Structure 1
Amino acid sequence: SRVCQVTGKRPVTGNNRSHALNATKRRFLPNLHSHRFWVESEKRFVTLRVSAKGMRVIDKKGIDTVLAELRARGEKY
C-alpha cells in the first residue's frame, strides 16, 4: 500500500472543484519513493518506502531513532 513507513502518511480523499465549483471526488496521495538508506549502526542498507518529509524527518531525527519507531511499532522493514 501507498503508506509512508515513517510518517504513516496515506492517501486522503478530497474534491476537485471547477471554476463553477463542480465537486468531483479525487485523492491526494503521498510523495512516496522507496530508498536505500545506509545505517552503519548495522553495516547494511535498508529500503524504506518513504515520503519526502519522511526523508526530511530521517534527516533530522536521524535514521536509528526512526528505526526505533517501526520496530517499536512492529513495522516489518
Structure 2
Amino acid sequence: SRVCQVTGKRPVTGNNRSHALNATKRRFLPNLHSHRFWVESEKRFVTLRVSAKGMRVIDKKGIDTVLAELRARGEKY
C-alpha cells in the first residue's frame, strides 16, 4: 500500500473546501517514489518505496543508518 518505508507516511483524509465552504471528503497521499539506493557496505542497490520527504532524510541520516532502523521495524526491505 501507499506507505513510506522510511518515515511511515500513509494516506490521510481531509475536506475539499470551496468558496461557499462546502466540504467534501478527500484523501491526501504521500509523494511516494520507488528509488534504488546504493548501499556501500553490501556494494548493492536496494529498492525502497520512499516519499520525497524520506529522500531528504536519507542524505541526512545515511543509507546504512536508516536500514538499521528498518530491520528493527521489521519492514522487510
TM-score of Structure 1 vs Structure 2, range by shorter chain: over 0.9
Identical aligned residues as a percent: 100
Could you say which structure has the higher helix fraction? 2
Shift, 1:55, TM fit: 0.5
Q: TM-score with structure 1 length normalisation?
A: 0.97
Could you say which structure has the higher strand fraction? 2
Q: What 5-or-longer segments of structure 2 have no aligned partner?
A: none
Distance 1:7 1:17 in 2: 28
Distance 2:29 2:20 in 1: 25
Quote the residue 1:41 is aligned against.
Answer: 41
Equivalent position SS for 1:57: helix
Distance 2:42 2:21 in 1: 53
RMSD across aligned positions (CA): 0.5
Shift, 1:40, TM fit: 1.0
Distance 1:11 1:38 in 2: 27
- 1:54 and 2:54 equivalent? yes
Distance 1:42 1:16 in 2: 46
Equivalent position SS for 2:37: strand
